[PDB]
Amino acid sequence: GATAVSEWTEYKTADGKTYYYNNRTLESYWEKPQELK
How does it assemble? Predict the structure, then answer.
């Protein structure tokens, strides 16, 4: 990756949980994708 930093959006919950929602693949990852680094 190391580019296209726009398809990976960070959603922060009030209780302090971070998950990245990727619309490209419709996949939700609770840990940072290697595309982000």
Answer: Binds formin. Interacts (via the second WW domain) with TREX1 (via proline-rich region). Binds RNA polymerase II, HD and SF1.
